[PDB]
Amino acid sequence: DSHQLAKALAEAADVGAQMIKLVGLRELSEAERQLRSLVVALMQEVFTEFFPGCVVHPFGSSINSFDVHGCDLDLFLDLGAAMLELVGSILRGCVPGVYRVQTVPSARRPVVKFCHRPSGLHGDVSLSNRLALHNSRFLSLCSELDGRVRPLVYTLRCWAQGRGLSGSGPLLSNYALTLLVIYFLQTRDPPVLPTVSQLTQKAGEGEQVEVDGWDCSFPRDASRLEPSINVEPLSSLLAQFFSAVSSWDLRGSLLSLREGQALPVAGGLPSNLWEGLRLGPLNLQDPFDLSHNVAANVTSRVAGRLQNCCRAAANYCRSLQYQRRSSRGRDWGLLPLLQPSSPSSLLSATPIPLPLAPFTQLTAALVQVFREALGCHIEQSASWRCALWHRVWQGRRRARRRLQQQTKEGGWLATEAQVTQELKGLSGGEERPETEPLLSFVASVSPADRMLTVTPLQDPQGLFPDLHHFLQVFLPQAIRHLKLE
C-alpha cells in the first residue's frame, strides 16, 4: 500500500513519471484479465444454456481501462424483480464457484451481487443497464484519445479515495469523478478531449445506437480523430485540475460533457430541464443520458469538502516540494496527494444519522444528551462547542455493572449520567480549575438532512475517533430512548 507506492514512486524522475508508474502498478495484470475473462465465459455459457441467445457484457471498471487490482467484475445480462431472483437462483445453483448471492432490487440500478470463490472475484449482475456499456466504452475511448487521461484519472481517483471524497455513499462515484476529470480536460483552452457532441457528430457510419431514447453514438477507434493540440504536461494538468474544480461554481452550474461546457442552473438550462434531472450541490451531466445527474447523490458537505481539499491540493501543487524532486526524501511530488487523509479528518467528514424528529426538539434533545449523560461542558443549522476532561466513551459496561451491583447489595438520561459521573469520580479524577480539556469538539446539525457532524477541536492524545464511534452508536440510542419516554 503506502510502502509500495512510496518506494516505487519516490525513485522515479518527475511527477509525470510518478503518475504513469502509478498507472502501471495499479492496472490489472494479464493473469487477472485472464481470470476475469474465464469467469465471464462460465457465466455466459450457463446463461446461454438457460437463456438462448443472451449475451453477458463485462462493463464498468473492467472495460473502461481504468481497472485496478481487486476491482469489481460488473456484468450486464442482455436477454422485473422476479427475473432478478431467477438470475440469482441460477447463479447460486448452476455456475460453479459462486457462493455469496444477494439480490439488491432497491438500488436505482437493481443488481445481483455475487462472489466467485475459486478466483476470489466478486461483482454485480445487472439485468438492464445498457448505458453502462456505452459510457464505459466511452471512457476507454477517452483513454485512447489522449495518453494523459489514464494517468490523470488513476492519480485523481487514488487521491479522492485517500481524501474520502469518493465512495458508495453521498460521496462521488468513481464514474462521477472520472466524468469530472474528462470534463476538466474538455474545458482546457487547448482542449485535451473532444466533447461528446463532437464525437457523436463525427462518429462514423454504422455506429448508430440508441439506448432508452438517448444517443450513445461515438467513434470506435481513436485513429480517425485528430490528436490534441495541448502540449501541457501531466503535473501542470493536475495542478490546473485542482485549481479549476476549486474555483468553479458547483451549485449554479450544470457541467455538460456533451457540450463540454458549464451551463447555468439560473435558467441557463434549455429544454425546460430535461425531465428527471435532479439538481443539487454538484451537477454533472451524463454524456449520453442528459436527464441523469451522476453527481445527484452528492450532498452539500461532500461538495464543499471536495472544493476545500482541491483548494489545499492546488496550494500544494504550487509548492516547491511538488515541483522539484527529492533525493532521499520520502515525501515529494505525487506522494503527499496519494497519502491518505487523517482518520480524524475522515471521521469528522462522515456525519452521524439521527432519528426522525422535529429540528428544535431534536437539537434540545442533543444538548440534553451532551449536558447530562455525558461529562460534556457545552456552550453556543445549530452548533455547540463541547469539552471533556474524562474518557466517557470507554468503560461504561463496568460502570453500569458497578452501579447495578450497588443496586444488588443495596428512566434514561440521569441513569447514564450517573454512569458518566461514576466513570469520572472512580476514577478519572476530580477534574480541575485552569481546565485545558482532554477532548474538545463541535457538534453541528443541519435542518435537511438532519445529521450530526462532529468535528474535533482539541485532541492531544488523539482519541477523537473513539469518541466519534461512541457517538455514532450512542446519540441515536439517546434520541431513541428519549422518544420512548
Numbering used by the authors: 145 to 223, 337 to 637, 763 to 792, 802 to 876
What does the published report state?
After transcription, the 3′-end is oligo-uridylylated by a terminal uridylyltransferase, TUT1 (TUTase6)910, one of the members of the non-canonical nucleotidyltransferases. TUT1 is composed of N-terminal Zn-finger, RRM, palm, fingers and KA-1 domains. The C-terminal region of TUT1 is a previously unidentified RNA-binding domain, and it was named the KA-1 domain. Thus, the present structural and biochemical studies have demonstrated that TUT1 acts as a U6 snRNA-specific terminal uridylyltransferase.
Therefore, the amino-terminal putative zinc finger (ZF) and RNA recognition motif (RRM) (amino-acid residues 1–140), the predicted disordered proline-rich region (PRR: amino-acid residues 235–304) and the carboxy-terminal region (amino-acid residues 651–750) neighbouring the nuclear localization signal (NLS) were removed. The truncated TUT1 (TUT1_ΔN) was overexpressed in Escherichia coli, purified and crystallized. The form-III crystal belongs to the space group P43212, and its structure was also determined and refined to an R factor of 21.4% (Rfree of 25.8%), using reflections up to 3.4 Å resolution. The form-III TUT1_ΔN adopts a closed conformation, as compared with the form-I TUT1_ΔN. A comparison between the form-I and -III TUT1_ΔN structures highlights the mobility of the KA-1 domain. The KA-1 domain rotates by ∼40° with respect to the catalytic core domains, using α14 as the axis of rotation. The N-terminal RRM is mobile relative to the catalytic core domains, and the C-terminal domain KA-1 domain rotates relative to the catalytic core domains.
